[PDB]
Design a protein around this nucleic acid. Structure first.
Ligand SMILES: [Mg+2]
Ligand SMILES: [Mg+2]
Ligand SMILES: [Mg+2]
Ligand SMILES: [Mg+2]
Ligand SMILES: [Mg+2]
Ligand SMILES: [Mg+2]
Ligand SMILES: [Mg+2]
Ligand SMILES: [Mg+2]
Ligand SMILES: [Mg+2]
Ligand SMILES: [Mg+2]
Ligand SMILES: [Mg+2]
Ligand SMILES: [Mg+2]
Ligand SMILES: [Mg+2]
Ligand SMILES: [Mg+2]
Ligand SMILES: [Mg+2]
Ligand SMILES: [Mg+2]
Ligand SMILES: [Mg+2]
Ligand SMILES: [Mg+2]
Ligand SMILES: [Mg+2]
Ligand SMILES: [Mg+2]
Ligand SMILES: [Mg+2]
Ligand SMILES: [Mg+2]
Lengths: 147, 125, 128, 187, 52, 52, 134, 104
RNA sequence: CCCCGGAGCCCCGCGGACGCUACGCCGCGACGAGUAGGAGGGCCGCUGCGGUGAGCCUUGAAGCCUAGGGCGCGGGCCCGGG
RNA sequence: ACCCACCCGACCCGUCUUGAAACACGGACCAAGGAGUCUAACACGUGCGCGAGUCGGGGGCUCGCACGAAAGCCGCCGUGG
RNA sequence: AGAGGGCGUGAAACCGUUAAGAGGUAAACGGGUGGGGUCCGCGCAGUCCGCCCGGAGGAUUCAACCCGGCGGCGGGUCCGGCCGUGUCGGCGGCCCGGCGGAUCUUUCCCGCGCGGGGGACCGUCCCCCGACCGGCGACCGGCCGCCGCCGGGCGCAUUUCCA
């Protein structure tokens, strides 16, 4: 809507909201990101630290297929499995201990953030965190690897 | 309900009329013709309307029935008063008074009724 | 006799002349419609002595007498006969105004219907 | 001539909601009347928080609602939130609740109605308690948005923990001169 | 759930017969003309041919 | 230019919400007369007719 | 409405196809309705007009009940010249005032074999259409 | 006019000026609310008025023809605020007004 | 030691506008300069589109002129004559 | 509101400027055209829907396209952001 | 042709003529007035009326009050029935209902350890009478109170119109 833009309220105003002394010239300070080390140095220091320089090694043919490792926490662990599986828990005089296949749900590594409810599980994942394994063995579960 | 459809109707109704600083409303059963929440007959559960008769003599009074919503054919009932005009004002006053039928429209309907009474006579020489 | 309004206040007006535009006396392309001076050195803009005056908010008429005719009514532009019953409950304070594009065939019907409904028309004797 | 500094003569607070939504305007009308008639401050706070914007009424989470309502003393109490009630999937048990809100999501609504609680609206809350008795007025995390992580003290500055506006994070987009002691200076 | 009345089914000449269907909750869905105007004026731009 | 952003896509839930509000205000004859439809002899405003 | 996407239905394009039509299409555009007796006798709604057809003038300043023979059909200006539909100039000479054939009804046709087979084809098409509508 | 199946209703309400035909599963916002104004006079059929419940459902039932869609919820249920404010449960707690106009 | 379908009152806890487009109406108090600039309201103006006015019109549309009647602080607008 | 008469005031508009009526610049007069737009990336604020989810991109199924190159839908309702 | 072969309407700048006014501080402008003109609104007095009441002139009917019919509002012990929500009862529909499940069973069947259809289980949507709380504006049929309309009895101290 050009009906509601600013160029309608500036009809009659001479400098069109861009100043009388210093006019709206074409490119007063260069085009784009001009002047990195010079005359924009204070801006590039107090608003973009680390912008200049080399750091770290170079991995030439990188692909995300090798480094794809999606992570799930123990705080959201019963969310991947339907609710009647944990309704039918702490019953049957057995220690039922359901299996939560994490790779089936779409994650590889199980991390150890959050509180886990007191129910034994069999967590099948490709990778585990040590804190996650400590929480699972403290509840009374079992960490099973899978490839 | 009523306030909901008033919030809808209050600015984008077909009977609304701006043009030179007064906002009126031209629907039937809107006596005093205001675009107000008191004077709107389409929305409310109880509705008093005052109109001139089709024959030219008398005043028809329109009462909303309450017996059915979603049914505009049987939503209103029309009566015709053609009497000696004091009984007309008294009859419409008793309609809006004794039936407890929304007494805010009472004196304004008396105004519109007696203005139609002065309308249905020879006006000049 | 004519149609009298409900109340007849004394309409006071703070200024009855037109705010003409600067140098419209000098130039023909400069119309009489007001444009605010926006120059760095303008006599009218910085309000020197004895010039044209700028329209401020202080010239505002009273809210009881704003948009009021000298007869005591307020205009309402009316196109047809169905728009005359709009002013049926407002005839003591508002008056009908027949539009320019309305033909002379139904203008007589509008005038006689407003005469029946006791509504003042500011231009009944126009076309005939 | 009088020397009033006219910079702060106009208070910039909200008088009406900027939205044009008619249900919210009817709730605004009802709490306008309750604010300028009832002597309670609950209706004024509810009206002031119905005035606010969507980024100014934050979504309140179900586990924080359970946390703030299992405080001692507030048994038989209702929880009035002037924003939205969102479900947390990482809470297991949920007690009986009495939640008043503008909008509750479908999963949180199903969880409360399965636990056996009651979910009222604001007109039902005004019919239940017009002065606001038996209420606890809650609000979600105001600084919880990602937009507040970029505010405050500027980056490229010592003792500052501000996230800079980076189009894509990684190794070579930052963490160089300005962040390394080896490349000139760090902060 | 809100109240749902019982709407009759008319024949080919008026004269409502004995068939009566309960009113859906679609007719009791809430009214927001700001959303209706938003969706209308944004879907109305889609059958609009370019000019240059 | 031809590459102006001519077209607007709305959320599917917003389009369904607006069409449910339109179906809900297809009832309520105070909203139908304020649209401008002459209604004065319509026997029932959710006008449901036969399958013939 | 029209559903065929090959039919024009455009303002300037239909005005172009009207005012730049060739002569055999101008003959079909300049068709005139028949009288009620001829419609009852032939079951033909309208026909293109010929050099020597008999014409009553239906609308215009020259409206009347006089059956006038066509002088000649002038298809450039989309007009016809009739015998008694004329007018005196300043110099006393009479010039036939043209009438558009849409304001023209035929009372008698000038029948030849081509017109007979055209009317038989149109009556057969009306019979097929009435049988399809029946 | 809202039709369910095509058996001649689209051919019938076709040259009558003003009538827009809509299928039940193919309802159009631009024809159910033309010009942005929400109300519209609609003529339903029996197999359309019964199929609306199979399109959108009630609040306690899914759409049953769509995959994942429930009906929306009201921000406020009882919108009759006149009845709400004249109910005794609020006016018992309301105070006395101050409507004496104290002029200068 | 009685009810106000009426004690009859400067107040009617019995329903409760003439005053209520609640985005409305009303009552006090203070203030009112302005370039560059910023924000808000336009029932100020142009063009085209979706709705709407059972809108206007050869018994005269748009445009144009006006020593006429006016309204709005103003942008401009409504009539009268040709 | 048209013209004339009197009293007081009253230097020609825009711009560069600390300063313009300037012996600073542009400018006979009038009619029409005429200068902050469009795409993308963002940032903040606001309006709406859903909510630890959200979005359907792209594609496919329905109507032969008057209205349409619209709309509706998807074990693709999530490959992917 | 007040459309006359570059002709639809025909503005401004500019020019001619007529009428009016003025003229030695270039012309022009703002504020305040005064005078002269072109038109507008009255007016052979415009005192404009809108109510209530009193009096002298007229007058058709009806109101006051009853009878018959129709329509409407409000409602009780909730009168009887549908309808409708919150709980309880038959877990009754569950097979004389579909769907979904990362709950079991290959005690089963079919196409060859798999897929579908069966069998239980859970969640989501329904049937019958009875009670309570809000009978809830989602509807009727009787009963009572009130209001309006039509046709008669209502002859004139009542009733209403012109001056
Ligand atoms: Mg400025
Ligand atoms: Mg400049
Ligand atoms: Mg600027
Ligand atoms: Mg600059
Ligand atoms: Mg200066
Ligand atoms: Mg200041
Ligand atoms: Mg300030
Ligand atoms: Mg310079
Ligand atoms: Mg400067
Ligand atoms: Mg200098
Ligand atoms: Mg200067
Ligand atoms: Mg000098
Ligand atoms: Mg220079
Ligand atoms: Mg020069
Ligand atoms: Mg121009
Ligand atoms: Mg920025
Ligand atoms: Mg935002
Ligand atoms: Mg990315
Ligand atoms: Mg001409
Ligand atoms: Mg032409
Ligand atoms: Mg022409
Ligand atoms: Mg010419």
């Amino acid at each position: 809507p050009s009906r509601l833009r600013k160029t309608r309220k500036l009809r009659g105003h001479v400098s069109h909201g861009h100043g009388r002394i210093g006019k709206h010239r074409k490119h007063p300070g260069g085009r784009g990101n001009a002047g990195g080390m010079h005359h924009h140095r204070i801006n590039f220091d107090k608003y973009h630290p680390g912008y200049f320089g080399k750091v770290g090694m170079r991995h030439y043919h990188l692909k995300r297929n090798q480094s794809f490792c999606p992570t799930v926490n123990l705080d959201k662990l019963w969310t991947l499995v339907s609710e009647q599986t944990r309704v039918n828990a702490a019953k049957n005089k057995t220690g039922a201990a359901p299996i939560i296949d994490v790779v089936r749900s779409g994650y590889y590594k199980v991390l150890g953030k959050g509180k886990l409810p007191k129910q034994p599980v069999i967590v099948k994942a490709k990778f585990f965190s040590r804190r996650a394994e400590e929480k699972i063995k403290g509840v009374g579960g079992a960490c099973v690897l899978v490839a | 309900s009523a306030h909901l459809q008033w919030m809808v109707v209050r600015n984008c109704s077909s009977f609304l009329i701006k043009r030179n600083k007064q906002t009126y409303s031209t629907e039937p059963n809107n006596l005093k013709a205001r675009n107000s929440f008191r004077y709107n007959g389409l929305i409310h559960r109880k509705t008093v309307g005052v109109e001139p008769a089709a024959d030219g003599k008398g005043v028809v009074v329109v009462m909303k029935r309450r017996s059915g919503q979603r049914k505009p054919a049987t939503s209103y009932v029309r009566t015709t008063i053609n009497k000696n005009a004091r009984a007309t004002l008294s009859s419409i006053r008793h309609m809006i008074r004794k039936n407890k039928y929304h007494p805010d429209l009472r004196m304004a309907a008396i105004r519109r009724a007696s203005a139609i009474l002065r309308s249905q006579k020879p006006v000049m020489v | 006799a004519a149609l009298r309004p409900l109340v007849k206040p004394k309409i006071v007006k703070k200024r009855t002349k037109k705010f003409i535009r600067h140098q419209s006396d000098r130039y023909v392309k400069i119309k009489r419609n007001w444009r605010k001076p926006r120059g760095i050195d303008n006599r009218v803009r910085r309000r020197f002595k004895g010039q044209i005056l700028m329209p401020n908010i202080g010239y505002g008429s009273n809210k009881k007498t704003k948009h009021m005719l000298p007869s005591g009514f307020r205009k309402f532009l009316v196109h047809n006969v169905k728009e005359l019953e709009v002013l049926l409950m407002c005839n003591k304070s508002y008056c009908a105004e027949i539009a320019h594009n309305v033909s002379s065939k139904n203008r007589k019907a509008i005038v006689e219907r407003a005469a029946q409904l006791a509504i003042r028309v500011t231009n009944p004797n126009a076309r005939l | 001539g009088v020397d009033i500094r006219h910079n702060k003569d106009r208070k910039v607070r909200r008088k009406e909601p900027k939205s044009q939504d008619i249900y919210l305007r009817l709730l605004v009308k009802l709490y306008r009347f309750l604010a300028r008639r009832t002597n309670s401050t609950f209706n004024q706070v509810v009206l002031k928080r119905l005035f606010m914007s969507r980024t100014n009424r934050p979504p309140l989470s179900l586990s924080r609602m359970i946390r703030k309502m299992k405080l001692p003393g507030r048994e038989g109490k209702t929880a009035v939130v002037v924003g939205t009630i969102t479900d947390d999937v990482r809470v297991q048990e949920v007690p009986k609740l009495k939640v008043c809100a503008l909008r509750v999501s479908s999963r949180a609504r199903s969880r409360i109605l399965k636990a056996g609680g009651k979910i009222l609206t604001f007109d039902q809350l005004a019919l239940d308690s017009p002065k606001g008795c038996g209420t606890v007025l809650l609000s979600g995390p105001r600084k919880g948005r990602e937009v507040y992580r970029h505010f405050g003290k500027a980056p490229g500055t010592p003792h500052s923990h501000t996230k800079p506006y980076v189009r894509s994070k990684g190794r070579k987009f930052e963490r160089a001169r300005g962040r390394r002691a080896s490349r000139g200076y760090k902060n | 759930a809100c109240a749902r009345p019982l709407i009759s089914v008319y024949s080919e000449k008026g004269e409502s017969s004995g068939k009566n269907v309960t009113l859906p909750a679609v007719f009791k869905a809430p009214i927001r003309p700001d959303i209706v105007n938003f969706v209308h004026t944004n879907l109305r731009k889609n059958n609009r041919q370019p000019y240059a | 230019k031809t590459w102006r952003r001519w077209h607007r896509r709305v959320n599917t839930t917003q389009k369904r919400y607006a069409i449910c509000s339109a179906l809900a205000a297809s009832a309520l004859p105070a909203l139908v007369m304020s649209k401008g439809h002459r209604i004065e002899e319509v026997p029932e405003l959710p006008l449901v007719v036969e399958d013939k | 409405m029209k559903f065929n996407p090959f039919v024009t239905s455009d303002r300037s394009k239909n005005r172009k196809r009207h005012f730049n039509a060739p002569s055999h299409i101008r003959r079909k555009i300049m068709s005139s309705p028949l009288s009620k007796e001829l419609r009852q006798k032939y079951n033909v709604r309208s026909m293109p007009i010929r050099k020597d057809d008999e014409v009553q003038v239906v609308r215009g300043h020259y409206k009347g009940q006089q059956i006038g023979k066509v002088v000649q059909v002038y298809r450039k200006k989309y007009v016809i010249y009739i015998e008694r539909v004329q007018r005196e100039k300043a110099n006393g000479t009479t010039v036939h005032v043209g009438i558009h054939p849409s304001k023209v009804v035929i009372t008698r046709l000038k029948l030849d074999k081509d017109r007979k087979k055209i009317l038989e084809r149109k009556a057969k098409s009306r019979q097929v259409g009435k049988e399809k509508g029946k | 006019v809202i039709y369910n199946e095509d058996n001649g209703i689209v051919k019938a309400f076709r040259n009558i000026p003003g009538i827009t035909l809509l299928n039940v599963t193919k309802l159009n916002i631009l024809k159910l609310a033309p010009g942005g104004h929400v109300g519209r006079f609609c003529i339903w059929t029996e197999s359309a008025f019964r199929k609306l419940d199979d399109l959108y459902g009630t609040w306690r039932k899914a759409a049953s023809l769509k995959s994942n869609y429930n009906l929306p919820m009201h921000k406020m249920l009882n919108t009759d605020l006149s009845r709400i404010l004249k109910s005794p449960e609020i006016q018992r707690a309301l105070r006395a007004p101050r409507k004496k106009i104290h002029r200068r």
